[PDB]
């Protein structure tokens, strides 16, 4: 939830 | 476990299918390659602005000169890049469509064939194969497994190859543009992925595995609610509530612990991701300063590689899909590849003409596929002449039926041969054999169509004339013609349920249309009413006369006219001949002859959480700061690449990237404090209200009365379930989701404010694009669910005609016409087939549109970002910021849609949980109102009582019952049967108030009396006493609540109950645990303990409800001794079933239909002659008989 | 997750 | 530079 995917 | 070869699974794909798969996988690989090429260009764009970014800032002398070369470079470059992007868009569109369409088409085309072939295979199996298998499992296996295979060979493969293509395609560019950063990226790989996985795993915690935590309280709750009447009777509700509360108290603590740990875990994971993510970029910059790499190249490789890396995690699930699909395809193909010995779908063997019907069974040994465990037929010799009719008789084993079973060659015999005419049965074609043989069974079956159609299942080619003559020759014409719709009436399991004989007659008509040469009649007359039996018998007799016949039944009314009768013993044929001969034989036959002679607004649930004004503001403020902290990440990355792109003189750069990369991490660590907070504050907030809710629910569940607990709707399990789920569910709604949403709206809010203020009309444009692709993304999923539901409805109809076919199979095989069901199945399938063709056409367009929109949207991004915006003084660094910010906001908004179903479910689960609290009983034990009389001595006046149970207000139990019992005397109560005897005890305890009439104790009406105090003076003892898990002293002390009982007191009670023998014998003695958790005891001890419970209360009224019901031998004696010692000092009512032990009673009272019939002392009821005398005579007759 | 649809 | 991976 920052870039790559969380 | 068991899988299937990869080439076998696709055996039904040929020509166009393989082509579709090829062109599809090709297009899929291209589609895969498409994305990393997009990111490759993204570096070239950066370089374009970078070159100008450096030169623009390097001047500080001339201005107008920079308006020429720079703008021209940007012109040609940006135009080129935009053109390329537009180029990629059309590509991804086309290839996406091709991919999904083709793969789905192949899927459909194959699955169709799979279904057809499989059902054929099912139908082609021999009966022995069915006798050993579960049909339900097989049908469900069909419908469920073929779907799995479908999910397997579907578009999932295309996605797999696409993913592999982004993987390779990503890593290829990643490597070729530079080897270092890739390895440096791979170095940090064995942490980030694991962390992301961990987070994704932790946020799946809402599903019900909480049972492990709750079960402790759940056990208490279950044993309580299962024992409700005892806790009600002894009014220990406050105690049970207390225990439950304690267990909840533990549960919540364990909860908050879990919350702390989980939040720490997630926070740490996030930190690691942040840290590596920043670190890699710092190394990046460290490589850019050395001029080894271009600033854009860094981005290119970074993103290409990370894409390529994520591709694996995103790829993995489709492997499992195909993997599961082989496994499912194993057991399916196993039926299809299987070839039987019998067939019946084969065209082979002789089809003899002019069959005279001379049957003989020669030395037949047989056993059904229970095999060696039992051999029912031990050798055999039987002949039946042409035109004759033989009748088989037997005591048991149904070896009779076996011959009918074999005569159709449902089984081939172990040893021996069955011979129709001269030829062996196994030489003649199966179908033809089945066609020449007619059959009528005990239980007739009708398939669900018109009567004509059921008569048409005898022969496909037939006219209503033949039907008419058939039913008329079965004398079924009248009964059916009286029926409406004529021949077009309905039959089956659903609708038009008819008399058995009628159905049998329809079955005989059906069999009659078959015009067979051989007739087999097994017990068709049996299991039917005597009147219609003759009606059907007439038909059966009329069904012969043109045929040779073997008949079997238990009706020796139908046997006499037979030409030959045949008796079996232990599978051994013995007696054969005409009736008179068999009667002269005086054998088995003669023996048998002689033997037989939702969503709404619920705020109050939140108002209940309002108990905590704090803990929420903290989490929201914190989560809003997190929401404001989130885009700050994007603002940095903007200025990291921004300042480096906007650098100008390089000397100042290397110092600033370090200041940023530091800060880049600083928002990281601070993200650990905030995330853990909002997660811990909301968490702890969840476990507390879960205590309040479950406590307020359970409590109010003890408030309700026996009327509510007898409801079929509410059983212990259902209550515990309702108790667990709702409380578990509301927590999820009030929990993380909310925090996340607020975090997200905050996120998009700060993001959009920043983006909006920085870029003028740059943001306004994006905000026109993003919601359209999002909504376009939602509408696609809606069509997907629609087509899914519609498809489920169509195959449901085809699966319904399959279930009908494979359940009643043993009949369809007898009538053949399996091909009929094949055809019907096919026609049923043909509609889904055409539907599946359209599916691919749609699944493609919606996919390619959402992809193409995302790529074209990206063209507008830089096209408007460049050109009109960059020709103006507005700069690239802000563009890069806005894109990040906005799409971040959106992808955060996505979670809103993702988290929608939780509240909906919670509401429904919250809808129940508030109602259950507000429901009020007719009788409440909690009310402190009531008289609480001061006078001890108890009488009991029942007067004109009428009672019907609220669960069953049909047959009344009490009608005008009237009893009187003085103090200190025993009231025996005898009855014909039922709860009429117990309803007294129930009503005295006041589990119910009677419909009409009333009941007094001290002269005061119990109805106006206090409920608790009333129940407090009662020494109830039931049949099977329930004891809760705890010290037997705690089980005994349960007799008296609101006060702790003394040891010497429970000793005295135990001494009174005569249980002391056990209690002083045990190792633990009075502290021993009972109730199956720690120890086991027989009924006697339990009962004595119940007696102790009863008389420690020192009741004025003992109530002994069939106490010796389940008991035996001396136990009854000792327990009766105790019970006898218990009474005589108190008022009591005894309903025990041992009248020999009631012989000593002050007043015996026979009940009858709710009215007292006979009453008086023993000798008086004995002086009289009537019910009681009979009651005492009959059971005394049994004791005398046992000698 | 409070009353309209999150 | 958004969230899938640009």
Author numbering:
A (entry chain D), C (entry chain B), D (entry chain C): 1 to 6
B (entry chain A): 30 to 626, 689 to 1278
From the primary publication:
The transporter P-glycoprotein (P-gp; ABCB1; EC 3.6.3.44) is expressed in the intestines, liver, kidney and blood–brain barrier, and affects the bioavailability, pharmacokinetics and efficacy of drugs. Each half is formed by six transmembrane helices (TMs) and one cytosolic nucleotide-binding domain (NBD) along with interconnecting loops and short helices.
The R groups of this series were systematically varied to generate alanine-, valine-, leucine- and phenylalanine-derived compounds (QZ-Ala, QZ-Val, QZ-Leu and QZ-Phe, respectively) of increasing R-group size and hydrophobicity. Here, four new P-gp co-crystal structures with a series of rationally designed ligands are presented. Thus, we must conclude that the binding of subset A ligands induces these changes in TM4. The site faces away from the transporter, but lies close to the predicted membrane–water interface and intramembranous substrate-entry portal. Drug binding near the EH has been reported using electron paramagnetic resonance on a bacterial P-gp homolog that transports lipids. These data lend strong credence to the proposal of an initial lower-affinity ‘ON-site’ for a ligand near the inner leaflet of the lipid bilayer preceding the higher-affinity ‘ON-site(s)’ within the central binding cavity.
